[PDB]
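Hi there,

I know you've been waiting on this one. I reran it after we fixed the sequence typo, so this is the corrected version. Both the input and the resulting structure follow.
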Amino acid sequence: KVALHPHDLDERIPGLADLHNQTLGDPQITIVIIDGDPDYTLSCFEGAEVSKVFPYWHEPAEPITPEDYAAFQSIRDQGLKGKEKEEALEAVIPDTKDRIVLNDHACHVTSTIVGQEHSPVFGIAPNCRVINMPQDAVIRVMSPLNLARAIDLALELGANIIHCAFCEEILVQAIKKCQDNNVLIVSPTGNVLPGTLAVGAAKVDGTPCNTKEGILAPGEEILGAQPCTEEPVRLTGTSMAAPVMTGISALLMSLQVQQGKPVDAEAVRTALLKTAIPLRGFVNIPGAMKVLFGQ
């Protein structure tokens, strides 16, 4: 009845309003986002506990001009597809388009998780601690070696949740170390490991746009930030559903802290998966709250 903190996805995600009534996150919960380089000048990140840690083993990349970002956004807003989209990107931003895809993705994903209330993008968990670990410098990104190194560093930075927008034996063992150290890994199914929460995209009506340890969440028309403008945009894809689950998972962990319970990543992951309404099903916050908190 009364959403104390009205959120865009309240109607599409039962129990989100009620969960928001109880927490908007806790700064003791750290989320490390392994993605591109987000734009922290956006007002949705003002007052947010956000910081960038660039992996020390990357060569820093030259900053991308606002004009290049605007070119990419114009091409999206015209709704160009297929061969014509690619010919348009190649015509105007051939050297920078691949980095921009990553950086733009990072703005959107970070805004979905931690965007401040009453800004243009209100995130799921605006009071959690968020560290961005940009990877765009490596584009000259799906490399398993580099992701393993990035995951090891994210663990050392104190991650409770690692959001990997890109998730070889070395990577498999880095994921395993996260599980052994009670750190949740969240990644999209795409458009493979225990203790990973794999996320698929649901349409606006809740149907689907991996199956054993996956969950579906809203992935269509998700409101988020884009670089160099205060104007938000709605995007669609499995990598749009993943950040919704990262935020939800962070809220549930935040509630464990607020109730004086130890952070328990595996309890949160298994509660989500076992209560999902037929991957394993659509996210079911009311069921998860019952399993975790007796609500």
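Quick highlight: The first strand starts at residue 30 and ends at 35.

Best,
R. S.
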